[PDB]
Structures are given as C-alpha cells and as structure tokens.
Amino acid sequence: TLRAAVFDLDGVLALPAVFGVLGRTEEALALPRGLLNDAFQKGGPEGATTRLMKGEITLSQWIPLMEENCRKCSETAKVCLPKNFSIKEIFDKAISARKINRPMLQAALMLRKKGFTTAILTNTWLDDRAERDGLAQLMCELKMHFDFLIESCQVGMVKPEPQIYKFLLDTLKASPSEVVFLDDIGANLKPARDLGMVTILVQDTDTALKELEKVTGIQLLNTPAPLPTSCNPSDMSHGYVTVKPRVRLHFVELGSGPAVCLCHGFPESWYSWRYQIPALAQAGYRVLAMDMKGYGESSAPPEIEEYCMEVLCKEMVTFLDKLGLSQAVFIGHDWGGMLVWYMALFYPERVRAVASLNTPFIPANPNMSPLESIKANPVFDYQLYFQEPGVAEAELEQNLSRTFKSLFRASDESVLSMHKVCEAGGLFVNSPEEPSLSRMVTEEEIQFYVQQFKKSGFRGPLNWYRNMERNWKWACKSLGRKILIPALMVTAEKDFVLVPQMSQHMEDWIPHLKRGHIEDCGHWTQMDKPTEVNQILIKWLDSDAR
Amino acid sequence: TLRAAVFDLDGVLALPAVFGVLGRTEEALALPRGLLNDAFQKGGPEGATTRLMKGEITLSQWIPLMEENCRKCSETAKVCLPKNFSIKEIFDKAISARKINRPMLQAALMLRKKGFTTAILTNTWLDDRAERDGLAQLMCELKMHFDFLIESCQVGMVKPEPQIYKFLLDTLKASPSEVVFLDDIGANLKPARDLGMVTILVQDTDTALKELEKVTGIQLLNTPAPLPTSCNPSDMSHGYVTVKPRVRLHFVELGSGPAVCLCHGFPESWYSWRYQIPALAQAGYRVLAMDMKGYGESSAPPEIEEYCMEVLCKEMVTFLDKLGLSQAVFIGHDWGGMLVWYMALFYPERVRAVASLNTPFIPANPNMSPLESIKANPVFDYQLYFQEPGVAEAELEQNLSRTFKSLFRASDESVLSMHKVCEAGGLFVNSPEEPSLSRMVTEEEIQFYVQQFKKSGFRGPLNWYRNMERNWKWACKSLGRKILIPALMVTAEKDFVLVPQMSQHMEDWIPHLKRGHIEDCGHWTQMDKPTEVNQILIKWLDSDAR
Ligand SMILES: O=C(N[C@H]1CC[C@H](Oc2ccc(C(=O)O)cc2)CC1)N[C@]12C[C@H]3C[C@H](C[C@H](C3)C1)C2
Ligand SMILES: O=C(N[C@H]1CC[C@H](Oc2ccc(C(=O)O)cc2)CC1)N[C@]12C[C@H]3C[C@H](C[C@H](C3)C1)C2
C-alpha cells in the first residue's frame, strides 16, 4: 500500500547534523551543557531561528541575532563566553563537515526504482555566506535522485507546523497511510504521525534502514553494489556546433571545471558514455560527449574521404575553437581511441591529457601497406569485408535490432565469428536471426541506438574503415615524434580483436605512459565495466590532468 | 589591385620575437655575441631546428639537441657556459613574454573589413611543454580574425623554402601581385619578392604600418577606436535545455572558466549581448547568453501566468541543475535586470555574484498596488497600454521592421513619446511609418530581431507585463531580507524611463553595493556603450566574482 518515502536532509541524508556539532562545541569550549542549543531556539515561533527557517531573513542576517542570544544565555547561566567566541566559525565548520550518507541515498534510489515517489522535506535557510557553494553543490547531487524537494525557506512554513505536512500531501497526490516519513528529530514526526503517516526516527542509519526494509518489504541493506548513475537523453543539454558548411557536430554537456571530450567507437553514439558523464561531472569536470561525424545528430556526408583521420582531427580542433576552449582532455574508445592518439601527435597544444580505452597506439609501418598487414591476421578479416561500398551497409541496415543485439555482448555471450567473414559471405551467415539480449544492455538502451541509426544508416560509420591507405600516408609524417604529454592506456583482458599484448611496445613512443587494466572485460568497455572505468579515469584525471 | 595580406606571427603579430630574447640572454649571461643564435641554426636544413619547424620532432625532443648545440658552440668559442645554463628556462620565459601587437591586429582587422583576405604564415613548432596552454590561448585569440592560418609544422614545409610560398598562393586563389607580405626576417621576404609579392620588412610597428597604408590606400594609423568584436550567430555553439515538458530554453555558449549567465530585456534576444560575449570569454569566463522565455528559439506558451517572476526564476534554477552548474554569476538588463535581483533574494546559494544594467532594485510597497504606483508616474503610461491582451500585439506585429527601428535608438534619436500612449491610442500614433536607421544598429542587426520575432510574435514578451499583482504578492515575502552577496548596479544617464535617481535608496537593501555609471547612455546600454559596459563588468568580475 506504501508508495511514497519522505526524507529529512540534516541528520538523515547528510551527516553529521548541525545540532550534533553544537553539542560537541559546548564540550570543547567547556561551556554549560545545552547553552548553544538554548540560544539557537530562543523565542520559539517568534525567535530569530524561526524567521530564518521561514525565509524572512538570511543566514548572515541571523548570525548577529544568534550571537546576542548566546550572550543573554550566558548572562543568566552566570558564565563568560571565551574571548574568541564566533557563531560564524562554528557554523562554517559544521556545514563543511556534512557529507552524504551513502547507505541512506542507496536505499532511496532503490525505493524509487521499484516505483516509489521520493521527496526531501527539510528545514533550511537562504544561505548567503561566502562559502555557500559547498551547500549548493551538495543540494545538486541530492536533487537529481528525488521526485520532490520541499524547503521551508521557499514555502514560508516550518516543521513542525501542521500546514507544511498538508502541503507535502497535496504535492505527492497521496493519502497519509501511503507515506513513510524519516526524520532524526522526534518533534517533527509527531504531526506526520497524527495524520496517519508511517514514521521512522533516525538515530543510527543501520537501524533506520532495517525498519524501512520491514515496512516496505524491499531489501535495502546487504544489497549488491549498484551500477553508476546513467543519462536520460531528454534531460541533457544538447549542443550543436557547425564546424564547416555541410558539417554540424552534436554533443551532450554536463558540469563545470576543466573540459573533457569523450570520443566513441564503431558503431556507437554519445550514449555509449552514459555511465561516465554524471561521474566525471561530479568529480569536478565539464564533460562534452560527442556524436562523432557520421553518427546520430551529427552530419553524415556520404563521401568516403570525409572520414579520413586528417579531416576528422581538423574538425575536432575547429570544434574547440568555436566553443572557446584552448585545451581539453581527450578520452577515446575503439575508433575514437585511435583518433585521440593522433590528436596528441598532431595538436599537442590543444590536448591537456590523452586517454585510450582498448585501442593501443599503433605506429605506421612505412614498409608495409595497412591492407597487407590486415591480411596477415585472420582476426581482422571483417575489415576486408567492410571495404566494398554497399555490401556491409545492406547487411547491417536490413534489421537494426538484430545488428545491435548481435554486437553489444559481454565476453562470454559472443554469437559472431569475426574470422572467415569474407569466406562465409557475411557477418550474420551462421548467426541467429533473433539473438538473445545481453546482460550488459536493456531493450530500451538498444532501441536508442536503433532510433539513432534509422536516421543516419551505416554508410558514414563504415567509411571510417575505407581510408586505410590515406590514413597510413598521413600517419607516416609522425614517425620521428614521441608523445610527451600526460597519457593513459587502458587494456581490456577479453577483447579478442584489440588484445592487451598489442600494446606492449607503447613505452618506446610514450615513455612516461601510465597504465590501467580491466580483467574480464570485452570490447564494449564503458558498458561492460562502468565502475572500473570511472575509478581509473577519475584517479588519473585528478593526478595528471590538474 | 591588392586583395590579400599575409602576416608572420613571431615579431609581427606577437612581440617580442624569440630571436630578440636569445640576444638579450647572451648580454645578461656575458656570453660571446651570437653564440645562442649559432647553436639555434646549427646544421641548416639538416639541423635540429629545421626538423622542429617541419614537425618531424616536438619542442621537448628539440631542447636536448639545442643544448648539445650550445656546448659544441662554446667548445669552439673557447668559453664555458654558466653552471646553471638551461635552454628550457630561456625558452619558457621567451614564449611567456610574447603578447599581441594590438596596433598590428587592429590594422589586419580593418583590411579584412574593407574586403581583403587575411592570413598568417608562420614557422612554428608542435608545442608539448607543460606550459603549452599559453601558446594555445594566444593562437585562439588570433585565429578568429584571419581567413587562413598556415603553420610550417602542419604542412611539413618551412620559410624560406620556395614551395611554402607556392602553397600559400594556391590557398588564397590569388596571383603574387595581389598579395602584401609582412615579415620581420629579411631572408623570408626574398622568395615572396621573387614571385612578385609586395613585401614589408617589420623593424618597428609604426613604420611598418605607414608602409602598409601607402601601398593599400587605407588609413590604419591614427584611426578611431573600433567597436568590440561582435558575434556571428551561425558560428556559435547553440544549446537547448528542456526545463519542463512544454518549455525549452535556448542559449549561446562561449569560453571556459566560471559561469556567467546573461539575461536580456524587452523586446530583445540573446543577440543583445553580441558585444560582451567574446570579451567576457577572453577575460576567462564561460558565457551563457539566454533567449529568455517567450523569445527566439526558447519556448513561448501563450498563457499569461507562464511569465510571472516566480515561474521565471524557478526555471532559471532548473536550467543550472540540468547543466550541472552549482553557481553562476547573473547579469541582467531591463526585465532581465529585475529578474536577477529577485534570483539573488530568493536563491542566493546559486548566485556567485549579481549585476544589473539600468534596472534598480525596487522593493515592493505593501501599502500600494503596483498598478496604482504606475498611474502616479506619467512616464510609465505605456505599461497600462500593455495590459489588454491583443491590443499592443496587433500594433507591434503589424510591421516588424518599423517596431525595431522605432525602439532601438540612441538618446538623441527618440521618435516615440512614452507618455500619453493610452490617450493617443497607440505607441506609433504620431510616429513615422518608416523611421530612420539609428547610428547604434545596422539593417542586418535589425533583420535578426525581425526574423526571431516572425516565429514567436509579441504575446510571450508582453505577458512579462501582465503579472503586476502576482509579482507584487511574491516580492512582499522578501521585505525583511538584505542582499549580502557581491553586487553591481550600473546606471545609464540618459535612460528617461529607468532614471539613475530611481536607484538612490539601494544601499539600504544592499549595503556593500558597488556602482557603475555610464554618461550619455540611453536605454539600450549593451549596444549604446559596448566598450564601457565591457570595462565595468570585467573589472568587477575579476575583483568580486573570483
Ligand atoms: O575494428 C575496430 N573495432 C571493431 C568494432 C566492432 C567489434 O565487433 C565486435 C566486438 C565484439 C564481439 C563479441 O564479443 O562477440 C563481436 C563483434 C569488433 C572490433 N576498430 C579499430 C580501431 C583502431 C583503428 C582500426 C584498426 C584497429 C585499431 C581496430 C579499427
Ligand atoms: O518597461 C520596461 N522597459 C521598457 C522597454 C522598452 C523601452 O522602450 C523605449 C526605450 C527608449 C526609447 C527611446 O529612447 O526613444 C523608446 C522606447 C521603454 C522601457 N522595463 C521594466 C523593467 C523593470 C520591471 C518593469 C517595471 C520597470 C522595472 C521597467 C518593466
């Protein structure tokens, strides 16, 4: 019958509570017990703190009123406050110490996932201090995980006034018996309980969570590690930049701080970085996830030479120029990974740092055509099949659902044989016509790629493979160079085409190269091991790209 | 007959030249004259420096080769280099000291304006040093002002090889006698001169510019102060964010660093900030210029209540949330200026700093309806005319060209009388049917506004005026508050509706308010005095919003 869960901020979703810091300051300063809490509440509904919580005055206007409340309390208590007493210092440290209670947030996320409406109902102030950014940052991280955020200072009502609970019920469109309410202050539970709501008094998180599992019938404690927060395309800021008359690049943007450009592989989308876009923004970076040329909402000219590495890299520099970015960190995977190594070799001044997932830095061999080196390895046979225009397009566009379901698979789910593709006469010759859904992706995620490839088709994406000779000649120009800017190479143990051993001689070209390695990871790295990728990238960015 | 002008970077568009720093280091370190310049050129076409300029090796790979060239030169000269000798330190300081030669750039801009094709042809390197950002930043500022940028390390050719001059002519589609070429190194002029090009040897800027005026017949020296760099809409990154199901906000974005949100007034566009968008990005800020709700590419629902201040401010906070910005500096003008004061009063944590152009902070009077206060001032009579839905829309939409030409005027060009608008029966009753073009705007600029208002119309924009009672009730909630975050009020001397005297009691509400004042400036501040606005905003941002 329960369908809504309301949480308080201070003491429930964020720890420690302000009141806890007030009690700890009395002990540290050897003041009489409760003196700071008495000054805090002095006057009740007509006092300074109620005016602050109703949004009548701001935090800075309240600080001198709280200080005089402290002196009046000490006069009565017959004590002297220390020579260096400051409400501002005490409050700054208290607000700064507050961190998200991860287990409490994890339980809130699981409830919403199972169909619950979630909300935060809190008594808070209009923060105008010089350090107010810390509070804003915390609220933003929490905001995206709940259906509603109700703050006292915005609605002009405070807990425990009964009208704020009537307002809460009208916002949720729910009756009181369909609501569970969590708060660390007993007084605030009393009116919710009077209306008939299920209340949980929060003293310690683990006990609070056990009461919550019992009443909802959903397991919250001891639960498996969840996947990182993913992107909803319709909630993203969508950017459009024209780099040349017929070419427009589309990107998705989130966060503030140093620019980080993400470059996908074949046959993918900006959406392949869905698990890293919120994580990198939260770590303090401005993320720009591209639809590469030939894909999604980016332009897709039909000409083959529009997709050679030289044209592609030049358009990426123009993209930075039109956005007003002197530098960006470049992170690529698959074809995008090959492109970022060549961005570092040809435009080092525009690249703050460079990282590749799966794709090693392959220097051109001046004594051998790339097409002849492809024939030496039977694993690369699918590349020869991709050369004839129209042939692979017809097979991949014939059934879009089948195409993405057969390709996007974890290492133990492979349904295609990438060798003898030419001899068989296709990629899907001895392949099931209706493949099973991989554990890595959902039907909804697959349908995004199907919808994006319904507009463009496979011509543009396949053309990245039809410039082998042209790319080989261009790469030969960089044979005497070394990559001396910060660099990261991440290998994936189970990629059968881009094997980790293909990257072993990279130190000869990138002497101070840093490495990452992911076990039990196939070709589709970002969606196969999203947590591991996030950890490797965030640690490297914080040490080498700052 | 001349139609193209080519400039060198080092020693021409950027001063001082690297070679100058090399000569100054020999004097400072008491080394034999020319020793550093000999090591620099050692080997000619087969030497390290030619390999560096052709892009064969990077700057970091070259530094140890230049150092051994310095030792071999000192062995022959029978001298000992100082114990602390470092090519890296010498080059870092030389590159860092280089600044744009403003008079040279100003002359290049004027030539392009008068129909010339402009280009930079330079001998440069692939910069992979840890400080390479400084070079990237400089190149970006220059890049946007020229038709072509040709760098030796990218084309694999160097000056003075004759092939690089053939490549230059083929890029410009011009014959040698149609080209003027400026360089500070005589050797590089020789091959251009052989082809028949007009060459100018640059020793000092003023003499170089006088030779350039004589040969082009265009005055470059002693010229009036130009207007700041303006925006070309088709070259901007366009962003689209959905803040609620039927409401999508459009914005234009440029630069990196702290976020600065620009909010236009009535009846304007993001385009009203065209003169400040490049300046604020160049000062080190990430600019977001909005199309406010009801305007341009932003949604325009017809309902009146969709434009009350409360809804408008809430959508601006959502806009920051979807972009991943915890804070932004808010700068508004006219209706946008009124909105940013209320953003600071209602959401101080999301506002880093707040600035208003023309619009004073007007606190609500609880003892008087806003409509009655409007009737007390005959200047505000046009506001009563705007109340009836459909009436002002029909008059303003009847002829879009006339509407924008009659409104956008400098202080001494007024063609409308904003008082007795109701008694006359319209805004354009005794107004010319074909007004003259104001000196403030061009026909092309006017046509942008006409094109944008052809889609939306005036319903949405006029609805900002049809919520007087609703805005008054909402504002009354903030009567006990003070604005204690960094704030700037800019007054415009000749605004006859928003007079500077209307802002005199603002210190009572914003005690540490900073002020700006612009003389001989009418209502349309950004386009009336763009240089003055830029200077006031950049100085305040650097001191109070950093
Ligand atoms: O071919 C390239 N990727 C393919 C993309 C599709 C994938 O299909 C798969 C992947 C996995 C499975 C499975 O587990 O069943 C099946 C099919 C196979 C690899 N990328 C490059 C990237 C650079 C430049 C050039 C040469 C070299 C280095 C490889 C192309
Ligand atoms: O009415 C507002 N601006 C008008 C916009 C159009 C302009 O038309 C002009 C301007 C100049 C000239 C000329 O030189 O001939 C002619 C017409 C007149 C002023 N803005 C507000 C902004 C806030 C909120 C509310 C009340 C008060 C404070 C004024 C609206």
- The domain locations on chain A are 1-16+97-217, 17-96, 236-545
Nearest atom in ligand 2 to the alpha carbon of residue B411 is 14
| Interchain CB distance below 8 Å, A349 and B55 | no
Query: Would you say the C-alpha torsion B337, B339, B342, B344 has a positive or negative sign?
Result: negative
Is the omega angle on the peptide bond into residue A245 within 30 degrees of 0, that is, cis? no
B132, B144, B254 member nearest A348 (Cβ):
B132
Token pair, residue A16, equals: 């420690």
Ligand 1, pocket-test mutation among A266, A340, A375, A469, most atoms within 8 A of CB: A266
Q: How are strands ordered across the β-sheet holding A4-7?
A: A148-151, A117-122, A4-7, A179-183, A198-201
Contact A464, A294 (CB under 8 A): yes
Nearest CA to ligand 2 atom 19: B497
- B409 close to ligand 2 (CB < 6 Angstrom): yes
Q: How far is CA B233 from CA A290, A331, B289, B298, B433, in A?
A: 21, 29, 12, 15, 29
| Alpha carbons A424 and A430: distance in angstroms, whole number | 8
| Interchain CB distance below 8 Å, B481 and A56 | yes
| Alpha carbons A11 and A15: distance in angstroms, whole number | 5
Q: What b-and-e string marks burial along B248-277, b requiring 16 or more CB atoms within 10 Å of the CB?
A: bbbbbbbbbbbbbbbbbbbbbbbbbbbbbb
If you search the block for the tokens 């046009």, which residue do you land on?
B382
B156, B324, B326 member nearest A133 (Cβ):
B326
Following DSSP, what letter does each residue of A170-194 receive, concatenated?
HHHT--GGGEEEEES-HHHHHHHHH
Q: Which of A62, A14, A11 is nearest to A39 (CA)?
A: A62
| Alpha carbons A41 and A187: distance in angstroms, whole number | 13
Report DSSP state, residue A415: -
Is the omega angle on the peptide bond into residue A267 within 30 degrees of 0, that is, cis? yes
User: Residue by residue, what is the 3-state secondary structure of B51-81?
Assistant: HHHCCCCCHHHHHHHHHHHHHHHHHHHCCCC
Task: Report the residue of B127, B128, B231, B246 to disrupt the A interface, i.e. the one with the largest count of A CBs within 10 Å.
Answer: B128
Contact B235, B254 (CB under 8 A): no
| Interchain CB distance below 8 Å, A346 and B237 | no
Contacts of B228 (CB under 8 A, 6+ apart): B275, B276, B278, B279, B530, B531, B534
For residue A238, list its beta bridge partners: A252, B240
What element of type H or E holds B251? Answer: strand B247-254
Ligand 1, pocket-test mutation among A405, A449, A523, most atoms within 8 A of CB: A523
Contacts of B176 (CB under 8 A, 6+ apart): B169, B192, B195, B196, B197
| Alpha carbons B477 and B328: distance in angstroms, whole number | 24
CA A343 to chain centre: 25
Task: Report the residue of A127, A229, A326, A342 to disrupt the B interface, i.e. the one with the largest count of B CBs within 10 Å.
Answer: A326
Cα within 13 Å of Cα(B393), Cβ side: 16
Contact B189, B181 (CB under 8 A): yes
| Interchain CB distance below 8 Å, B254 and A477 | no
CA B276 to chain centre: 5
Contact A184, A10 (CB under 8 A): yes
Q: Which residue of B lies nearest to A253 if distances are taken between CA atoms? A: B323
- Resolution, Å (one decimal): 2.2
B133, B140, B321 member nearest A321 (Cβ):
B140
Task: Tell me the chain A residues in contact with residue B140 when contact means C-beta distances shorter than 8 Å.
Answer: 321, 324, 326
Q: Which ligand is nearest to the CA of A496?
A: 1
A57, A349, A484 member nearest B136 (Cβ):
A349
| Alpha carbons B183 and B110: distance in angstroms, whole number | 19
Contact B352, B376 (CB under 8 A): no
Task: Report the residue of B58, B277, B346, B479 to disrupt the A interface, i.e. the one with the largest count of A CBs within 10 Å.
Answer: B58
If you search the block for the tokens 């992170």, which residue do you land on?
A331
CA A23 to chain centre: 37
Rg (CA), chain A: 29
| Alpha carbons B289 and B287: distance in angstroms, whole number | 6
Q: Where are the alpha helices (DSSP H) in A262-334?
A: 277-282, 309-323
Contacts of A504 (CB under 8 A, 6+ apart): none
Nearest CA to ligand 2 atom 25: B335
- Catalytic residues of A, by residue number, are 334, 465, 523
Q: Please give the annotated binding residues of B for phosphate, written as ranges.
A: 122-123
| Alpha carbons A203 and A23: distance in angstroms, whole number | 15
SS3 (DSSP) at B413: helix
Phi, psi at residue B318, to the nearest 5°?
A: -60, -40
For residue B240, list its beta bridge partners: A238, B250
Distance A334 CA to ligand 1 centre (A): 7
Contact B464, B307 (CB under 8 A): yes
The CA-to-CA distance between both ends of chain B, in Å, stands at 51
Q: Which of B174, B274, B282, B294 is nearest to B524 (CA)?
A: B274
Contacts of B329 (CB under 8 A, 6+ apart): B258, B259, B260, B261, B285, B351, B352, B353, B354, B355, B541, B545
| Interchain CB distance below 8 Å, B61 and A324 | no
Q: Which of B414, B448, B445 is nearest to B432 (CA)?
A: B414
Q: Is A69 annotated as a binding residue?
A: no
- B416 close to ligand 2 (CB < 6 Angstrom): yes
Neighbours of A533 (CB within 10 A): 26
Q: Which of A216, A265, A298, A203 is nearest to A3 (CA)?
A: A216
Following DSSP, what letter does each residue of A429-443 receive, concatenated?
TTS-SSPPPPTT--H
Rg (CA), chain B: 29
Neighbours of B349 (CB within 10 A): 23
Contacts of A283 (CB under 8 A, 6+ apart): A538, A541, A542
CB pairs under 8 A between A and B: 144
If you search the block for the tokens 């400036």, which residue do you land on?
B521
Q: Which residue of B lies nearest to A486 if distances are taken between CA atoms? A: B130
| Interchain CB distance below 8 Å, A326 and B58 | no
| Interchain CB distance below 8 Å, A126 and B348 | yes
Nearest CA to ligand 2 atom 11: B523
Contact B180, B4 (CB under 8 A): yes
Class of domain B236-545: alpha beta
Report DSSP state, residue A348: G
If you search the block for the tokens 């906070």, which residue do you land on?
B317
A1-16+97-217 and A236-545 share one fold: yes
Nearest CA to ligand 1 atom 15: A414
Q: Give me the CATH topology for the region B17-96.
A: DNA polymerase; domain 1 (1.10.150)
Q: Is A122 annotated as a binding residue?
A: yes
Nearest CA to ligand 1 atom 4: A266
Following DSSP, what letter does each residue of A232-246 receive, concatenated?
-GGGSEEEEEEEETT
Task: Tell me the chain B residues in contact with residue A327 when contact means C-beta distances shorter than 8 Å.
Answer: 133, 136
A281, A324, A480 member nearest B324 (Cβ):
A281
Q: Is A183 annotated as a binding residue?
A: no
CA-based angle A372:A374:A377, to the nearest 5?
Answer: 115
| Alpha carbons A53 and A57: distance in angstroms, whole number | 8
| CATH tag for A1-16+97-217 (out of 3.40.190.10, 3.40.390.10, 3.40.50.720, 3.40.50.1000) | 3.40.50.1000
| Interchain CB distance below 8 Å, B136 and A350 | yes
Task: Tell me the chain A residues in contact with residue B254 when contact means C-beta distances shorter than 8 Å.
Answer: 323-324
If you search the block for the tokens 């991440």, which residue do you land on?
A490
Neighbours of A101 (CB within 10 A): 20
| Alpha carbons B55 and A143: distance in angstroms, whole number | 50
Contact B271, B343 (CB under 8 A): no
| Interchain CB distance below 8 Å, A481 and B56 | yes
If you search the block for the tokens 């400080």, which residue do you land on?
B131
CB burial class (10 A; 0-12, 13-18, 19+) of residue A426? middle
Q: Which ligand is nearest to the CA of B336?
A: 2
Q: Please give the annotated binding residues of B for substrate, written as ranges.
A: 382
Minimum distance, in Å, between the CA of residue B126 and any CA atom of chain A: 7
Q: Which of A112, A89, A116, A91 is nearest to A10 (CA)?
A: A91
- Ligand 1 site, CB within 6 A: A 266, 334-335, 338, 359, 407, 409, 414, 416, 418, 497, 522-523
| Interchain CB distance below 8 Å, A327 and B235 | no
Q: Which residue of B lies nearest to A483 if distances are taken between CA atoms? A: B128
A57, A127, A253 member nearest B349 (Cβ):
A127
**Backbone angle region of B24, left / alpha / beta, with phi > 0 → left and psi within -120 to 50 → alpha:** alpha
Token pair, residue A12, equals: 């429930």
Furthest CA-CA distance within chain B: 96
Distance A494 CA to ligand 2 centre (A): 67
Q: Which of A301, A305, A308 is nearest to A249 (CA)?
A: A301
| Alpha carbons A288 and A317: distance in angstroms, whole number | 14
Contacts of A106 (CB under 8 A, 6+ apart): A220, A223, A226
For residue B248, list its beta bridge partners: B242
CB burial class (10 A; 0-12, 13-18, 19+) of residue B286? buried
| Alpha carbons A334 and A362: distance in angstroms, whole number | 12
| Alpha carbons A315 and A20: distance in angstroms, whole number | 56
Contact A403, A396 (CB under 8 A): yes
- Catalytic residues of B, by residue number, are 334, 465, 523
